[PDB]
Design an enzyme around this catalytic site. Sequence first.
Site, short mmCIF file in Angstrom:
data_model
loop_
_atom_site.label_atom_id
_atom_site.label_comp_id
_atom_site.label_asym_id
_atom_site.label_seq_id
_atom_site.Cartn_x
_atom_site.Cartn_y
_atom_site.Cartn_z
N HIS A 61 1.14 -2.37 11.02
CA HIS A 61 2.23 -1.72 10.51
C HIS A 61 1.76 -0.26 10.07
O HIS A 61 2.83 0.76 10.05
CB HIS A 61 2.83 -2.32 9.47
CG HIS A 61 3.03 -3.79 10.01
ND1 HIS A 61 4.27 -4.14 10.63
CD2 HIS A 61 2.60 -4.96 9.56
CE1 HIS A 61 4.25 -5.60 10.84
NE2 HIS A 61 3.25 -5.94 10.07
N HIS A 91 -2.06 4.05 1.91
CA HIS A 91 -1.72 3.98 3.42
C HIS A 91 -0.61 4.98 3.77
O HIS A 91 -0.13 5.70 2.90
CB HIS A 91 -1.14 2.73 3.94
CG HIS A 91 0.14 2.30 3.32
ND1 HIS A 91 0.04 1.71 2.06
CD2 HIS A 91 1.28 2.45 3.42
CE1 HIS A 91 1.26 1.63 1.35
NE2 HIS A 91 2.24 2.08 2.36
N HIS A 93 3.00 6.50 6.40
CA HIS A 93 3.95 6.35 7.16
C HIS A 93 4.36 7.71 7.88
O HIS A 93 4.08 8.70 7.26
CB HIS A 93 5.36 5.94 6.41
CG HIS A 93 5.11 4.77 5.55
ND1 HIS A 93 5.48 3.50 6.07
CD2 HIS A 93 4.69 4.77 4.46
CE1 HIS A 93 5.47 2.50 5.17
NE2 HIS A 93 4.74 3.32 3.93
N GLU A 103 9.56 8.49 4.25
CA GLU A 103 10.39 7.29 3.78
C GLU A 103 11.55 7.77 2.73
O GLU A 103 12.49 7.71 2.97
CB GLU A 103 9.42 5.97 3.39
CG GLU A 103 8.68 5.26 4.56
CD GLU A 103 8.45 4.05 4.09
OE1 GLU A 103 7.68 3.68 3.05
OE2 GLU A 103 8.64 2.99 5.11
N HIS A 116 1.01 6.65 0.34
CA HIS A 116 1.50 5.66 -0.59
C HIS A 116 0.26 5.31 -1.23
O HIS A 116 -0.75 4.70 -0.38
CB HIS A 116 2.26 4.58 -0.21
CG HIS A 116 3.80 5.16 0.30
ND1 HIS A 116 4.68 4.17 0.91
CD2 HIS A 116 4.45 5.84 0.00
CE1 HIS A 116 5.81 4.72 1.16
NE2 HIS A 116 5.81 6.01 0.54
N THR A 195 8.41 -1.26 0.63
CA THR A 195 9.27 -0.51 1.54
C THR A 195 8.87 -1.25 2.94
O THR A 195 9.58 -0.96 3.88
CB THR A 195 9.06 0.85 1.86
OG1 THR A 195 7.82 1.16 2.32
CG2 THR A 195 9.25 1.69 0.63
N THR A 196 8.20 -2.26 2.81
CA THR A 196 7.88 -3.26 3.78
C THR A 196 8.00 -4.74 3.33
O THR A 196 7.93 -5.08 1.96
CB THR A 196 6.33 -3.19 4.53
OG1 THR A 196 5.48 -3.18 3.43
CG2 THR A 196 6.05 -1.79 5.32
O1 LIG Z 1 3.90 -0.13 3.75
C1 LIG Z 1 4.03 -0.09 2.43
N1 LIG Z 1 4.75 0.87 1.22
S1 LIG Z 1 4.46 0.42 0.00
O2 LIG Z 1 3.76 1.40 -0.88
O3 LIG Z 1 5.65 0.00 -0.58
C2 LIG Z 1 3.52 -0.92 0.21
C3 LIG Z 1 2.91 -1.96 -0.92
C4 LIG Z 1 2.37 -3.02 -0.27
N2 LIG Z 1 1.77 -4.00 -1.06
C5 LIG Z 1 1.64 -5.42 -0.86
C6 LIG Z 1 0.97 -6.26 -1.96
C7 LIG Z 1 0.66 -7.42 -1.99
C8 LIG Z 1 -0.90 -7.88 -1.92
O4 LIG Z 1 -1.21 -7.18 -0.67
C9 LIG Z 1 -2.38 -6.64 -0.79
O5 LIG Z 1 -3.58 -7.60 -1.06
C10 LIG Z 1 -4.77 -6.83 -1.65
C11 LIG Z 1 -5.81 -7.82 -1.75
O6 LIG Z 1 -5.63 -8.23 -3.15
C12 LIG Z 1 -5.15 -5.78 -0.40
O7 LIG Z 1 -6.21 -6.25 0.44
C13 LIG Z 1 -4.10 -5.80 0.43
O8 LIG Z 1 -4.28 -4.14 0.94
C14 LIG Z 1 -2.63 -5.69 0.22
O9 LIG Z 1 -2.05 -4.15 0.19
N3 LIG Z 1 0.94 -5.20 -2.75
N4 LIG Z 1 1.25 -3.82 -2.26
C15 LIG Z 1 2.09 -3.53 1.15
C16 LIG Z 1 2.66 -2.38 2.03
C17 LIG Z 1 3.34 -1.32 1.54
ZN LIG Z 2 4.14 2.67 2.26
#
Ligand SMILES: O=C1NS(=O)(=O)c2cc(-n3cc(CCO[C@H]4O[C@@H](CO)[C@@H](O)[C@H](O)[C@@H]4O)nn3)ccc21
Ligand SMILES: [Zn+2]
Length: 257
Positions: A61, A91, A93, A103, A116, A195-196
Amino acid sequence: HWGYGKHNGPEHWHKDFPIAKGERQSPVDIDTHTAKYDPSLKPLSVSYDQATSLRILNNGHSFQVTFDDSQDKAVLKGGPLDGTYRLLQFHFHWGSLDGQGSEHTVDKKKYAAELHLVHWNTKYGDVGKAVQQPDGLAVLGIFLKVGSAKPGLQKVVDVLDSIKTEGKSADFTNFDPRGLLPESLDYWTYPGSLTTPPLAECVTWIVLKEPISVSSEQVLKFRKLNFNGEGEPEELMVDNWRPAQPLKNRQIKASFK
Ligand SMILES: O=C1NS(=O)(=O)c2cc(-n3cc(CCO[C@H]4O[C@@H](CO)[C@@H](O)[C@H](O)[C@@H]4O)nn3)ccc21
Ligand SMILES: [Zn+2]
Ligand SMILES: O=C1NS(=O)(=O)c2cc(-n3cc(CCO[C@H]4O[C@@H](CO)[C@@H](O)[C@H](O)[C@@H]4O)nn3)ccc21
Ligand SMILES: [Zn+2]
């Protein structure tokens, strides 16, 4: 089961994740004439000097750079936040063309991309617990426009050929995320969501007013990544952005006049 295509994109996400139609979803349009200056908001404290990047990964993604968050090394504090938030990953977008990809939007303007930097509140001990809390995460959002190159992004761009398809990762040590920040830390802030999927309503959004400039060559390299895994039909990783969601009962605050 979810992506950015016609049959699995943002308009479908609510079926598996009903919070997609919730009261504090992200992103939003930032209407600059309705956002209110809040003199109570503090300067944002970005303390990234001891950041330890670990890996860069194509997750189907986006692509993400991950950090060691087992200690207070790279942290965000201040601004609208109470307490200390550790950097976990960043990361992006982006769009298929320069007029879309962000976004958040500003008075309906879309930027070519959005960065982000995802941080979690140390009061909750680990990120999985933080995502279950209304103040669990803080995401620093930075807009990208196309113009001059961003020198601090080049080390990222030059490794993307090694993670072209979903599932691929590489070592990405000693990367300094300070090189991705604009000069000014003036910001807008509001309570929102990931946002995902799973779209959890756990995020204090901090969106910087000043975009960074990247070159056309740099964003072209983003657009050569693939959503698909190796050996599947090639589908360019472009337009991996969720559109603006209803603001509902929320106020966007500005740190600046
Ligand atoms: O696409 C996006 N826009 S966002 O900024 O809203 C955004 C926020 C997030 N998050 C998801 C999570 C829950 C844990 O997952 C994380 O687990 C960690 C290991 O503990 C990392 O290894 C791993 O990278 C992972 O991120 N926290 N943030 C994901 C995508 C997006
Ligand atoms: Zn993001
Ligand atoms: O004296 C003040 N200084 S203040 O700016 O901090 C301030 C803020 C407030 N409020 C903030 C909110 C939450 C958001 O809802 C708001 O957004 C609108 C569009 O979203 C509608 O939902 C509704 O009409 C609403 O305007 N409700 N009231 C009241 C007095 C003062
Ligand atoms: Zn799926």
